[model samples]
Target: MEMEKEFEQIDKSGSWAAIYQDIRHEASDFPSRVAKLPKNKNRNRYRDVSPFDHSRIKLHQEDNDYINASLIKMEEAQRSYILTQGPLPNTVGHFWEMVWEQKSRGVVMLNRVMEKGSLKCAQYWPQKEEKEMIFEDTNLKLTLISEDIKSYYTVRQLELENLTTQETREILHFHYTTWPDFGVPESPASFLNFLFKVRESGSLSPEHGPVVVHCSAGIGRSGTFCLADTCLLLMDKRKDPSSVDIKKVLLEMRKFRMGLIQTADQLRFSYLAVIEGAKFIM
Candidate 1:
C-alpha cells in the first residue's frame, strides 16, 4: 500500500515496540548454519560476528580464509549495496579486497571507534592530514585526499590504488558521527541531510557500483540507512504508488543479508525518517 496514506492508518501508540517484537520473531528463524570451511570461520574477526553461511560472500579468486561481506540488490530500483561489519584488524585487507572486487565507489560508516567504554569499530581509515594507509595483505593503498568536516558527519575523499597496476580511483567516505553507539540520530532533518549528501555524490545511483555500508555488525544502523534510502527512492519513483511499505521492503533486503534493523528504537526511527523524507522529497 502507499506509505503516506497507509501510515495515516497507523495509531503509532507504542507502534514501534510492537513492530520490533514482530521483527524479532521474524529474525529468529534465520539460518543459523555456518559452513565448516576455514574461509568462513577464520576471516570472521569475532567469534560472535560470523556471517550466515547462506548469505556470505564467496571469493572467486585464489581461495583463502578471508572476507565477510554481503551483496544486497534492489532489483526494481536497479541498485546494489554492500552491507558489511566494521573492518577488523585482520579483516581490513579483506574489506578493501571486497571493495576492489565489487568496484564500490563509496562507503557509509554508521559507527564510532568506541562505545560505552568498549571498542566498537577499529580506526580503519587514515586520520585527517595523514597521507595514506596501506592494506598490505591486499596490495592496496588508500590515500586520504581531503576531509570535509560537518556538524553531524564527515566526508573524506580517498584514493584507492592498486600497487601492482598503478590503477587508482576516487572513493568517498560518509560517516554519520552524531549517531550514538547503539541508538538513533537526534533528529530526522540531520539524518535526511546526510542521506541526501550521499545521493548528491551519485554514490547511490545504479550507474555506479554498489556503495559499501557498515556499522559495528553490518546490521542495525546500517540496515536502517538502506531501508530508509530504498523507501525514499521507491517513493520518489512511484509518485504515490503502492508497494512502498517500509517493513516489507526491509524483509526483502534481509534476504540478502540477515538481521537488519536491530532494535525497536532503530525501527521506529526509520519510520520517522522515511515519513519525514517523503514529505521533503515530494
Candidate 2:
C-alpha cells in the first residue's frame, strides 16, 4: 500500500489489527542460536525477542561475541541502524564496545532506566554527578561533558575514550523520555520533532556509522522510530513522495530483525508518523 491510501486504509481501528496480523504472518522466524547460547543467555532482555543469527552484530574482541543486537541496513533507503535491547548489567561493556567499534555518532534511547517501578534498563552512561564511567572489561571510559534537557527528551554529549590506546571520540546520546507506558508516542508530531532534531545533528548521515536505536526489547518503539525515519527518507529521495509503501518497507526491515513492531497499535503509529513527516519533504 502507498502512503496516502495506506493511511486511509489503516486509519480505522479494525483495519489496524488485520494489517498487523498480515505483517506478522509474513515475517520470517529465522534462527537465533547465538542469542540462546547458555553463556550469553542473560544478555537478552526478553526471552521471546532475539536477534536473528544472520544479521546479529559480532563483537570483534571476544571469543564469546554475543550481544543481543541486530544490524538493520536498508540499502534502498541508504540507511543503516543498529537496533539493540537495553544494556544488561553484564553486557554494558559489550554495548559501548559495539558503539566504539561501529563508529556510530549517535545513540537513540527510547526508554528510561526505570519504568512503572520495574528496572527496564541499566544505567549504562555516566550522569551529571558521576562525570566518568569506566568499563574495565572493554577498556573504555565515558565522560558526560554536557547535557540539554527538553520537555520530552534529553540530549547529552559524551567523550568516549579507548583506555587501551588513549583514543577519543565524541558520541551524542538522544534520550526520548516521554514515551507513554502504552506502546507508541503520544503523537507523531512529538515523535517527529525528536526525529528531526536527531537528523539535524547529521548523525544519521552515511559518513558515520549506523545510529544505534534501542528500547527495552529493541523491537517495538525502536522499530517504529526507524521505520518512520526510513520511510520519510525514502519519500524525500523519490520524485513521488506518496509512492513510499510503509508496509513493504517495514517487511524489508523485519528481514534483518525479528518482530520489528510488537503490537498492532505500533504498526498503526508508523504509518501515521510517516504520513505526517512526508509533509516536510513534499
Candidate 3:
C-alpha cells in the first residue's frame, strides 16, 4: 500500500501543484524548430504545442518534413505512442501519411471535434454521406467501414488505402467523447475502463510502430492517458503498483514532448487513474 499511502499524503497535503511544477521545471529545453518554419505554420492548430525536433515524426519522401507529432517511447513499459494535435484541415494528409509511415493500427482520440461550442479539432476522417476521404497530396484513401457508438465513447473502424501501392490497412479509431471541455474525466474508473478497452485490441503492443494518441493540443488529456497506461503497465511488470512513481514517469515522458499533463488537476487525475487501474492487475 505504499502507492496508496503516497497518494493519500499528497491528496491530504494538497501538494499536486508543487509536484506538477517540479515536473515542469525538470522538463528539458528540447528544440522544436521545424514547427516554427513558415511552410509548416498552417499545419499547426495552436501557435504553441509543437513537436520536439529530435522526436518529431517525418514523412517519407516529403519535401517538408514537419508535422505536429512526437514519438514518445517508454522503454520500461515497452510502449511507443505518437502524441499529436488533432489534424488541421491543411495537415490532414500529413496525419494520414504519419499513420501509414508509422504502420500504426490504432488512433486514440481523447477529445471531441467540437467541445463547448469551440472547434477543438477538424473533422479529418470520413462521416455519414461521405464514407470515404481521399487525400491527393498523400495519395491515400480513407474510408469509414463501421462504428459502435457507446454513451461515453465511440469505437470506429477505418480503412486506409495507399493509392500508389494499391495496398490497404484497417485502422481503429477509439474516440472518448465524454471528456469534459478542458476538464478531467468524472471518474478514473471510466478512464481506466476505456484504457483497458484500447489495450484489448492489441494495437498498443510493440509490434506496431506506435499508436497515435491525440487531444486538442496533443498534451493534456493525451498525456494523462499515456502516462496512466504506461504506469499501470510498469506496475503490472513490477507486481507492486505502488512502486511506480507517477511523477517520475511523467518527467521521463515530457522529455519526448513538451507540456505533457497540462494542468495540476490533470496530473492528479493521472495518479488516480493509475491507482484505480492498478487494482485490476494487483
Candidate 4:
C-alpha cells in the first residue's frame, strides 16, 4: 500500500519539471557531439550520457569505459564525474562486474543509498565466504542521515572491516526519503541541502573521482537525479537556469548510453525534477 500511495503522490505532484522545454533542446545536441568525437575518446567522454546503443556499447564494459574515458579525465581536469546508475532491475550482474572491473582498474567505488535493504543486498552479495569482501574488495562508502539508524550501523560495519582511509565520509541527513518525497517541499529542500553538503564536503572532487548513485531499478530515481544535476550544470553555463532543454539533454544522454531516463515515468520525473531544482536554486 505504501508503494502504491507513494506512486499516487508522485503522480499527483506532476513529475514534470517546468524546465522541460530547454532540456529537450539539450537532448538533441548529444547525438551530434557523440557522432563527432573519436570512438576511443568517446568511450568515457560522455559516458554519463544515456540511451546507449547496445550494439555499439557493451553494458559490461561501462564501468571500464567510464574509468578510462570519463572519470580519469575528470580527475585530471580537476572536475568531478557526476556518474549515475539506474535501478537494479535494469542493471544486472554486469553492472556490478563493471564496478569490480573499475576497482581492478584502480578506481575507488563509492555506493550511495537511502534504503537499508539496498545496503543489506550489498553486504550479502558475495555470500558467507566473502562476507567481508563487500567492504574490503572495493573502496565503497555509504551516505546516511542521523535518522537512518540501521543503515548507519551497516555502513559503519563496512568501514570497520574495510578500514578505508577516513578520507571518505558519509553524509548525514534528517530527510525521510532518499529522494525528495515526490513533489513536496521536503523533496526539493532535501536535494538542495544534499547538493550543498556534497560541494562543501568536496566529495565531488575529481581526486575522489565520481560519485556512484543507485536506487532500486537504477533508472527512475537515478536517472532523475542525474538529469537534475546535468540540467543545473547546463543552466549555470548558459546563465539562464529557468530554461531547461529536456529533449536536448535526453538526446545527449542517449547518445552514449541507451537509456538515460528509459521509462516514460522516469523521463517525466527528470523533466519535473530539473525545473523544480531550478526554482529551488533560483
lDDT tens readout by residue for model 3, 1-282: 366778899899989889788888888778888899888878898887888889999888648878899999898788999999999888899899999999999999998899889888889988852668999998999999999999878999999999999999999999998888756766887788888899999889877879999999999999999998888888878855567787788889999999998898898788788777777775
Please report, as a residue range, the 10-residue window in candidate 4 with the lowest summed lDDT: 67-76
For candidate 3, which ten residues in a row score worst on lDDT?
Answer: 239-248
User: 207-271 in candidate 2: lDDT tens per residue?
Assistant: 99999999999999999999999988887788877677888888999999999999988887887
Q: Worst ten-residue run, lDDT, model 1?
A: 27-36
TM-score of 4: 0.46
> lDDT (0-100) at residue 224 of candidate 3?
91
lDDT of 1: 0.78
Residue 261, candidate 4: C-alpha displacement in angstroms: 1.9
Give per-model TM-scores.
0.89, 0.96, 0.96, 0.46
Higher-TM-score candidate of 2 and 4: 2
Backbone clash total, candidate 3: 0
- Global lDDT of each candidate: 0.78, 0.89, 0.88, 0.39
Cα shift from native, residue 62, model 1 (Å): 1.7
lDDT of 4 by residue, 1-282 (tens): 222233456478865443343444454322424323465343232334433222122334333332222221121123333233332322233334343333321111222443434341132232232332333323443322222233212222121121344443333222124443233233355554455544554444544535544443333454455556666666666644445565655555544433445455556555555655665666
Q: Which whole-number lDDT from 0 to 100 does residue 115 have in model 1?
A: 79
How would the candidate models be sorted by lDDT, starting from the highest?
A: 2, 3, 1, 4
